[PDB]
Amino acid sequence: RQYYLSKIEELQLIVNDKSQNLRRLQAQRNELNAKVRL
Amino acid sequence: MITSAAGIISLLDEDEPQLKEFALHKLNAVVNDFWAEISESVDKIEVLYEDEGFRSRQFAALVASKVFYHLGAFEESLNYALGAGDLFNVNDNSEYVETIIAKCIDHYTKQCVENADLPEGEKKPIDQRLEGIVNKMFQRCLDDHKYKQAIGIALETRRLDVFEKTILESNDVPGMLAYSLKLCMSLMQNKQFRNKVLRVLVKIYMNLEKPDFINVCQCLIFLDDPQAVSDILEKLVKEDNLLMAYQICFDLYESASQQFLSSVIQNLRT
Amino acid sequence: AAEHSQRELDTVTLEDIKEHVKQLEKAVSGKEPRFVLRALRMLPSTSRRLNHYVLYKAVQGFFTSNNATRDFLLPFLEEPMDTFRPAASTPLLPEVEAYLQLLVVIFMMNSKRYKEAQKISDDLMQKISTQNRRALDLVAAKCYYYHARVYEFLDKLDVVRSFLHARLRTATLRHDADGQATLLNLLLRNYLHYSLYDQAEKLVSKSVFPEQANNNEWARYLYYTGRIKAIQLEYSEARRTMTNALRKAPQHTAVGFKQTVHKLLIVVELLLGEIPDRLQFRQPSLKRSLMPYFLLTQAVRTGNLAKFNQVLDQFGEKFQADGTYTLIIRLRHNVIKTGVRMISLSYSRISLADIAQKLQLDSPEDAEFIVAKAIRDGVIEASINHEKGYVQSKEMIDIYSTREPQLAFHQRISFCLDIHNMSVKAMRFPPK
Amino acid sequence: DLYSRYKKLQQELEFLEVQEEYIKDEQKNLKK
Amino acid sequence: GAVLQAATGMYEQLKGEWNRKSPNLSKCGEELGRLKLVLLELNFLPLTKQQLILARDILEIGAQWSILRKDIPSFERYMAQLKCYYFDYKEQLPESAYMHQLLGLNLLFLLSQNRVAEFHTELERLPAKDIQTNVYIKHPVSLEQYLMEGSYNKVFLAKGNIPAESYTFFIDILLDTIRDEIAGCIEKAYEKILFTEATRILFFNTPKKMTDYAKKRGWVLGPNNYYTTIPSTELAKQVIEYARQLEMIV
Amino acid sequence: DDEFEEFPAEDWAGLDEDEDAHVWEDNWDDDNVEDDFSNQLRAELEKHGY
Secondary structure: OHHHHHHHHHHHHHHHHHHHHHHHHHHHHHHHHHHHHO | OOOOOHHHHHHHOOOOHHHHHHHHHHHHHOOOOOOHHHHHOHHHHHHHHHOOOOOOHHHHHHHHHHHHHHHOOHHHHHHHHHOOHHHOOOOOOOHHHHHHHHHHHHHHHHHHHHHHHOOOOOOOOOOHHHHHHHHHHHHHHHHOOOHHHHHHHHHHOOOHHHHHHHHHHOOOHHHHHHHHHHHHHHHOOOHHHHHHHHHHHHHHHHHOOOOOHHHHHHHHHHHOOHHHHHHHHHHHHHOOOHHHHHHHHHHHHHHOOHHHHHHHHHHHHO | OHHHHHHHHHHHHHHHHHHHHHHHHHHHHHHOOOOOHHHHHOHHHHHHHOOHHHHHHHHHHOOOOOOOOOOOHHHHOOOOOOOOOOOOOOOOOHHHHHHHHHHHHHHHHHOOOOHHHHHHHHHHHHHHOOOOOOHHHHHHHHHHHHHHHHHHHOOOOOOOHHHHHHHHHHHHHOOOOHHHHHHHHHHHHHHHHOOOHHHHHHHHHHOOOOOOOOHHHHHHHHHHHHHHHHHOOOHHHHHHHHHHHHHHOOOOOOHHHHHHHHHHHHHHHHHOOOOOOOOHHHOHHHHHHHHHHHHHHHHHHHOOHHHHHHHHHHHHHHHHHOOOHHHHHHHHHHHHHHHHHHHHHHOOOOOHHHHHHHHOOOOHHHHHHHHHHHHHOOOOOEOEEOOOOEOOEOOOOOOOOOOHHHHHHHHHHHHHHHHHHHHHHOOOOOOO | OHHHHHHHHHHHHHHHHHHHHHHHHHHHHHHO | OHHHHHHHHHHHHHHHHHOOOOOOHHHHHHHHHHHHHHHHHOOOOOOOHHHHHHHHHHHHHHHHHHHHHOOHHHHHHHHHHHHHOOOOOOOOOOOOOOHHHHHHHHHHHHHHOOOHHHHHHHHHHOOOOOOOOOHHHHHHHHHHHHHHHOOHHHHHHHOOOOOOOOOHHHHHHHHHHHHHHHHHHHHOOEOOOEHHHHHHHOOOOOHHHHHHHHHHOOOOOOOOOEOOOOOOOHHHHHHHHHHHHHOOOO | OOOOOOOOOOOOOOOOOOOOOOOOOOOHHHHOOOOOOHHHHHHHHOOOOO
């Protein structure tokens, strides 16, 4: 029961962290792609 | 009142087993207060547990499991919690028992999937104590009436027997069946295990008092079993429920592939 | 006049409380951590005012769903006679209620009211032990910190050892960072307050301090482990850790913390044979406090035993008040080692009789034993020649062309590349 | 409920890993 | 219940034999063994005040027997349990007459086997007022300080200034410890020390004893009685690591 | 910012008068004792002829 909740919250924090990381990577790639396109 | 730990660890070095047993009881009394002094003296607990002549070797295993749970040695803490025997009271709501339960479940799931993908002859023997504590957790989940959680753990552990038990013993058989069907179709990537789950679902559906023949046919299409669908249609014809037959055939055409329909129409003719 | 200004101050403090509550609510929005430390950062500023009127207004303002958890603070809460929900009956977020209870805790802490303070802190941390949300982990750190602080002036710091141990573990499994560091520091302070240095050392060796910890918490941990290793004869690493602590301490505030760390650093450096720089003995905020340690240091530089004894006799109360008496005694017997370090720093080759004459050692063999003992440690790099009487020092090879600069500059790479990597990782672009 | 949320979290995490690896590869190629 | 009275009678007999000039070693040892056995049922550690007092007396007699037996490992465990019974959270036991005697006993023991860190921690445990006042702990602290300076001859002089006869046991082993530490510091200090000077200042009065101790260590006599490359591998790895941290994106 | 109240903020008594309150950053060597110069010189060479 509560083991489900512990796993869920751990995955939730991991997913939040990796989502911020992915957003940052997307911004970097977007700026580089904009430079290339220009 | 006590001042430090050195007294009890010093008692660990005595020769009389009863002194060691009393010291182990004292250690299990206060291990959440101060574990560090026992961490370096763990070897004493190890040799005490490894002595087959110790009547309370299970208490030594429990103490070492607690200490390693402090240390984070969760593999070794799991090993010595399994070695703790029945003294590991699952029903207790302590933090230690709870996190060791979580580690037990994770280890069981890992070993279970590793055995499942492997063929029959290469299955590494799962520890009986780990399987037993997992079964105890399954029973506790069943008693607490949280049937969905037990279903999910059973799916994780590839244990179709517990999955069937949870589905049948649940108060709402059709609702749990629908929930399991949605889960299996939308979440499971293991094709062979999804097929096993679908076969279990089909068997439960047929053994239901009023079979959900529509869902049976859907699951059979997913399993690619035109023979079973043809036999179901023949039985429906014999049993006069023609509206089931017609709706089933229409769903079959709307969903099943051309080869599936050809096989069904062939078995229907013969 | 005074009433008007008091009312305006109370209103603006209430507005800051509203803003902090809104920030805590926003922190859960987006399902991300942080944005709570923004409210918790101005915690000393809000704590400074904490009038009864503003506390009562906040209690009545954010608790439209009346429960018993507030009905305990109300008996101690005093409302204005002649003298606002910011607004439906939406249930309170756990972080918000924990926050308001924490400011209640701080107010009751400030007014010397301790027993009911113990009660309210107990009811505060009883609930948070049930939650499993990371948003309530940052607040839990301050909750534990002021809980221990409340038990401190209540002179019951020994009682809470079990509770802090349990919460420290709980944080360890949940991979908490701020709560873990705060709990570890509180545990170290608890161990030190009863001189359980061995227990603290054992705890330190088995517990890893989180790297992402706050600056203040890192400084506190460094000071505590430095005191450990200093009273545990590991003088060199203790001094290194104490200096590192002074680097990370706040610059403007933390006068008492810096005073204590400077006192211990002085004693440790003197024990190591080095001489603390006179600059620290000159800052105003540090001068008078270090004045007893100043008269001491001079004696160590001179080796004047009578001056050392007089300083001890006239300042033992102050030395014990900060728990440096024992280390000062060890220094009283390491003054000779300090003198030998100076002698070997100045001279290259020197006869042992000269050592004895300069250090007032009254024996050449005694000087030989003392210099041999000192050179056994890393105190002095030399090579005694008993056949003649030399204390010949080691030849100073060119540090360049010796792979030593390569090692140091490699460490500095590792650091700078690491800094660049964390900087580029923490950019955190927003969604909109 | 709980298991469904947990499985959704795992699937989302795996997809995030896929996107991260994709973006790193594309970053290398875009630098070229 | 009556078990504590039975233990009281038996350890009264034990101490009656103990105060005799030469108590029977095996008899008192077995008496203490079964005594702590019944002490276990008598709530060994966590309470009746007399209960704690009698347990403290049992452990004190046990430690003093342990030193009297002339055995080290048991002594550690007896004083460890006694520390568990000594001075923290107790606040109810009357100030024992043997408090400081065994406190200094433990301190000198810690000095004996090169446990200076533990020695100073236990110094921190006990109150500061007795450190320079009580002779029983003034002594071991004094030898520790003399060892810290390096005034070994002072330690040899003060070896006869023990505050009680129940100190010589590891006074001897500490006299050996200071000599072996002297030898270690000598080998890490000098370049090539002559045999006769070592014999003089190692306090090995018998030259044969000094030679035997020389054979005891890898530090050997010698003939006349007178006792780089560019690695390019790991630092190449370091440079490649820098190259990695430049590349491979964030 | 933490004020570190756990460590008592050691009050500088009553901000009593200091030594100099000067602006005079000094070193460790300014506190010793000395006896002029010429005295030394004559006192150490008249033994050899001054």
